[PDB]
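Following up on my earlier message about 2-acetamido-2-deoxy-beta-D-glucopyranose. Here are the inputs again, as you asked, copied directly from the submission form:
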Amino acid sequence: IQKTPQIQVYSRHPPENGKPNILNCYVTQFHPPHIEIQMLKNGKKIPKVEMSDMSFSKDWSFYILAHTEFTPTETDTYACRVKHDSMAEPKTVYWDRDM
Amino acid sequence: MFFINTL
Amino acid sequence: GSHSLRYFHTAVSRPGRGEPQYISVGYVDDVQFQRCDSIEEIPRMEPRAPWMEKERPEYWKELKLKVKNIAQSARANLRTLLRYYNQSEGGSHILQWMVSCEVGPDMRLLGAHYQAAYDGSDYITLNEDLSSWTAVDMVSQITKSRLESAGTAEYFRAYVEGECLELLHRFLRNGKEILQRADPPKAHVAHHPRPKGDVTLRCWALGFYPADITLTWQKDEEDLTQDMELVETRPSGDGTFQKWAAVVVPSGEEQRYTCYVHHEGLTEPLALKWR
Ligand SMILES: *[C@@H]1O[C@H](CO)[C@@H](O)[C@H](O)[C@H]1NC(C)=O
Ligand code: NA
Ligand code: NA
Ligand code: NA
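Thanks, got it. Here's what our run produced:
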């Protein structure tokens, strides 16, 4: 059964400009388990993105957390880009400091 | 760490 | 106050290059303690929580053998499933299963689970009696008949009352400071004007453990179930979870709305308003 991922991008701690933090991309509710996840800063791929182990929920769908160190500012933009076989094209979600 | 062969 | 040992197992036929044929992750409650996998027949194990440094070398040697054996048996299970469902060779299929035991505060066993899924759908489940099974279709009914004619649930109960209890007891002792705890949510309401002139009120809850939580918005006397946007509870990455719920409200009506937070670490629901 094919399930499309749901994607959330958010900070470990509430953001304050100029203070080191951790950016999370949490990808849930997808099946089968193969997934491709990248994080970007100001249009450049971040090389040091850590990936949690993949696990799954009671409905058998898979979940995984990608994360990287980051320092929010008033001018930098961050994105997480996700590709799964349920999707014709990748999906990009940008960090919003309000959510 | 346990598995049951289903068939 | 209860605690569970849980393992989440996945076996993939024809994984991609570099991808596991078999992976399992083990948790106590909402804290992962290890990863096991097998890639091109090579088993590998990694600890994920600090108390695992106290395990002795024979734990990891016995576990490596169990990974090799489970990976081979799961591969063979995938091949039999392919045949019984008259599916074509060449595709990749998925076999998942969950194994758990649960104890109460006096460390007495309360229950246990064994349940399996094929290609993302229920296949067979052990019932709460720990002796009989529930199938979904005539293939899984063959499995049921084999397991019951054989008495296989006896060996599962031996695992629950042996190694499952042994490890749950030892992990709760060595990991007591992490596992026997409830961190309460730190809550607040944020306020975001919208270009149209109304307002988003976003009730936040952060820093809480375990993950289970409820967030609800309520108006003076009106029901907001269909009005609020709730995000899936999500890990912050340091052992704690975070969540929010939001409603859009007319400007000047903000004090009519209250956010209620329910969590095990609270004695009564938290009630928050903006500002
Ligand atoms: C597969 O074929 C057998 C007959 O050889 C039949 O009993 C079984 O119902 C078939 N399964 C499906 C899913 O069609
Ligand atoms: Na919202
Ligand atoms: Na709880
Ligand atoms: Na309010």
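One observation from looking it over: Residues C 189, 201, 254-255, 257-258, 273-274 surround sodium ion (ligand 4) (CB under 6 Å). Hope that helps, and feel free to reply on this thread.
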